[PDB]
Design a binder for this molecule. Structure first.
Ligand SMILES: [Mg+2]
Ligand SMILES: [Mg+2]
Ligand SMILES: [Mg+2]
Ligand SMILES: [Mg+2]
Ligand SMILES: [Mg+2]
Ligand SMILES: [Mg+2]
Ligand SMILES: [Mg+2]
Ligand SMILES: [Mg+2]
Ligand SMILES: [Mg+2]
Ligand SMILES: [Mg+2]
Ligand SMILES: [Mg+2]
Ligand SMILES: [Mg+2]
Ligand SMILES: [Mg+2]
Ligand SMILES: [Mg+2]
Ligand SMILES: [Mg+2]
Ligand SMILES: [Mg+2]
Length: 206
RNA sequence: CGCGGUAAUACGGAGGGCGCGAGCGUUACCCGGAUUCACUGGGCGUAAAGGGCGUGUAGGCGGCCUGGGGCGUCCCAUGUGAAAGACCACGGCUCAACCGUGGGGGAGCGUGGGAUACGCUCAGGCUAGACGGUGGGAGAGGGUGGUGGAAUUCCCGGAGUAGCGGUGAAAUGCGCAGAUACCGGGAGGAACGCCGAUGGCGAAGGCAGCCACCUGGUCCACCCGUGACGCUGAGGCGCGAAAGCGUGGGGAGCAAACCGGAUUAGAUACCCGGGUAGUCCACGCCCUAAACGAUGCGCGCUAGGUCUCUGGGUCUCCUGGGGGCCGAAGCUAACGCGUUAAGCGCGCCGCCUGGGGAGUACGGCCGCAAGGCUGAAACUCAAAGGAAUUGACGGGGGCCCGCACAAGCGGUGGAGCAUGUGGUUUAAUUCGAAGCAACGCGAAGAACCUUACCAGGCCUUGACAUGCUAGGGAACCCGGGUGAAAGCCUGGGGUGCCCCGCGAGGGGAGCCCUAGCACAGGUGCUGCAUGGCCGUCGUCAGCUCGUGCCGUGAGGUGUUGGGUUAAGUCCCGCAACGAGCGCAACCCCCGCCGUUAGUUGCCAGCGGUUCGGCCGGGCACUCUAACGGGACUGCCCGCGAAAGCGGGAGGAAGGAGGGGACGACGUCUGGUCAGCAUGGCCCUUACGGCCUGGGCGACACACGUGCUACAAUGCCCACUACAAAGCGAUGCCACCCGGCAACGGGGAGCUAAUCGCAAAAAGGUGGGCCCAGUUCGGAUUGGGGUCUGCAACCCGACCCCAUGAAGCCGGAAUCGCUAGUAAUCGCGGAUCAGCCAUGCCGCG
RNA sequence: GGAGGAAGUA
RNA sequence: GGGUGAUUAGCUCAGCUGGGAGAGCACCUCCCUACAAGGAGGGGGUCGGCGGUUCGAUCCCGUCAUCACCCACCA
């Protein structure tokens, strides 16, 4: 077991942070405090739409929160009795300049978590792992991709053992910088217990 | 075959689906499938199978030509082959089954007639097969008798002393009673060094000194003879390694069994000290085998190349007989065989039919016994077996490398102290961590809480979250008594927001307290049930794919071979050619420079200077942080083809310039339920929760990692310069005074290239100490202080008067380190009310 | 390259 | 009684014809390895007690004590 966080190795170059603001000396935590629950609030409320990203725009007092979901037709509400009441009911913990965005998605099956999200959702239902990833790592490559890799591990079949799995076609040069590869963090509470659904999706270079 | 070890298309039921249907299934039997008794239609190198070999009777089989008889054989006719059976047609039952009428095939035998290619037999001829005659050839083929030398062992004489012998090591053992080693003499046995080999000989078993007598087998040439006399061979008969046996001997060495020594957990063994049978000879037995080339004999045909043994022929030439070695086609499951077949055929012999039982039991023939030959079955298993592929593993080798061995330094192990660890104990000394991967590790926070441990006190819908019922109330501030604290009881206030009503007065959302709940909660258990994260191999250099090729196929090649490098890095070659993950490189810090920009810096040029970069002033320089050029074996002198190497110039640096981060497929069923999430078991009047105190610092011990040293390159005192990085407003602390000192009061500047922490030590000068247990070291301990927080005994510093211990260079061992590295000297950070910070991470 | 003729322990 | 001889660690035992008691096994620990071979430190002794010579005794000398062997003298 090795290979540290690819994004954690990216980070300070290529893909920039999942947030964006300077912070002063003793106000860092003070902002990070409620910054995290913002994310933690939605990673099980906004889920049934496929969440993969959440920026945070700040500088002073005013905060601009941008979400990156693929299925917005349900988070927006029948006319606003969601997206505009989610804002108002978001200040209740942090009286800040309530701002929001919703960035569209043209090709869902190209974001690493969305797969791992789809897989776990598909793993929870009694489905065929090896043959729910083979379909997956193919429809990834099908959507104009040029490489992929989706590793899962746990109690496959509920048997007492715990072998991981494989489902990959092509190149995933994790060790290179310009590669630009997104990484998926999933989780699956199940009958037997807890899984570990990962995913790599190579994309391009330069 | 197997399924069921929680989520069953196999079990029991249903719904449904499949197949048959007045039937459907089970069981039993016959044939098949079973090319698995092989006539069609098999095998015997390694799978079950070649007799241990030879000789040979009956039998089977047989070269060329000519003639006869026609026994087998073939052809035609005739008889038989009954009917019913099978076959074809036509008809009778209302079809069909059933039946009827009729017509052929005909295996087989008898008779007649005919044919003679083949097999048989008779007569005759021929020369390849076979044998013989002449001349020769080689040989560990064999039996008998003798004879030679070296070496072990023993006996005798002389000389000489303190050990010999044996093993990984020692011991049993021998030895002052004269050994081991020596010289002289003598005895007695077995077996033959070099030649000697991979060679020769025989049927096999087997055969190795020399000479001789007898003796077998084979081979070459001579154109002589016999003229198919040939081959195989059931039964029989003979030979038959070693061991064992009987009777007589011989016995130097070795040595089963027996005894002792030692290793061991024990050693009925391997190693050693003795040692009987035996191995040796004559005779007579068992007759067994990895008797193996695991390959029966005989003959013919199917390419070669190549060393050699042995004949012959006017000869690096031809030819005959053998033993080895690669390989044509062919064969095999492959390995492999290959003119000496496992190839293509013929003849004959023995043998085989899953493994275990079993080479057994019975019967029989042998043998003195040990045993041998012949040679089954009941029962049981769903495999046993052979070859080859991948991988793992190895107390198999080979190569490459790494502070792994060596050259050098410094240090642990030697003393005292900090930390952690094992044990020991206390009531608790929480848990985890276990060679390399634990032990200055989770801890980068063990005075209380942290805290998970002990003891006591107390709380139980709570310290928390969601939801419901009921009383009081909103909320929220303040206090007291007691009680160690927590907790318990009580008091003063105060009284909001929405549906009405001004009003006396109904209601509701939130929040709080008291009661019933649903509940949550647990550092409880399983890292062997997990997710995630981490270490090791290991920065090792490997992990694989597409096409092609080799193989029946698994698979191999590619990745292997030589060389080179840090490297699967690269080159040559290669039935391979390319690629993906990995090395590298794209990222960061340093070495160089350009520009941009000037609140640090600058008289480098000037103008005031309390002669300070303090100022005016300026941005080359200092420094700072953004993008960029630059180093690619680029060029040249040579070397090895090749990559590469000795260079050299220019360049700052040259062959990776020097560090960081990055760690593939995979093992370690590795570490972590105690960072967190989570299955399952458990705890829920407590295994949950709060407080005071105590404990992980306890100590006869031992280890791990560090700290000062045990001193003259040394140690004190005074004076005199240089940092790089990092950090800080409710904090950093200048500076002033006070303090003989840690520090106290006042307070400048700084939310930060400015202010500060902050004085850096080794360094330089100058004086002392002149080898001492020292003016080296500070452990322990008495007394005395300031310094933070509710509170400093176990369980803080710094400082003063001291007390001043071992320590004189450290055994077996053992540790890191190949360059600004090692050592030495010092400067920061990170958690924080205080608190585990000499450990860690950074800097010079 | 093939062929012939130096380990302590579950 | 007469004379030969011992006896030392816990043990089987050396010391040389006088000059600081020692090699093995066992015991404690440390090492390389996990065991066990194997090394380095330390402890361990009334040289059987008692004496005499000697500057100085494990050894020179004389009685005891516990043995062992041999030859009797016991009315
Ligand atoms: Mg980057
Ligand atoms: Mg069961
Ligand atoms: Mg046949
Ligand atoms: Mg075999
Ligand atoms: Mg027979
Ligand atoms: Mg007839
Ligand atoms: Mg001797
Ligand atoms: Mg005997
Ligand atoms: Mg006999
Ligand atoms: Mg021919
Ligand atoms: Mg059978
Ligand atoms: Mg008899
Ligand atoms: Mg330079
Ligand atoms: Mg594990
Ligand atoms: Mg000091
Ligand atoms: Mg002072």
């Amino acid at each position: 077991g090795n290979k540290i966080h690819p994004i954690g190795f990216r980070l300070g170059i290529t893909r920039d942070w999942e947030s964006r603001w300077y912070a002063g000396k003793k106000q860092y935590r003070h902002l990070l405090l409620e910054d995290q629950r913002i994310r933690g609030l939605l990673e099980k409320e906004l889920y049934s739409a496929g969440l993969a990203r959440v920026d945070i725009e700040r500088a002073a007092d005013n905060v601009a929160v941008t979400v990156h979901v693929a299925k917005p037709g349900v988070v927006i509400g029948r006319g606003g009795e969601r997206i505009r009441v989610l804002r108002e009911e978001l200040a209740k913990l942090t009286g800040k300049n309530v701002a929001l965005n919703v960035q569209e998605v043209q090709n869902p099956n190209l974001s690493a978590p969305l797969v791992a999200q789809r897989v776990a959702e598909q793993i929870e239902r009694r489905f065929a792992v090896r043959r729910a990833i083979k379909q997956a790592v193919q429809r990834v490559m099908e959507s104009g991709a040029k490489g992929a890799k989706v590793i899962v591990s746990g109690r496959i079949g509920g048997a007492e053992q715990a072998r991981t799995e494989w489902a990959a076609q092509g190149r995933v040069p994790l060790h290179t910088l310009r590669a630009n590869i997104d990484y998926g963090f999933a989780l699956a509470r199940t009958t037997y217990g807890v899984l570990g659904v990962k995913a790599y999706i190579f994309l391009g270079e330069v």
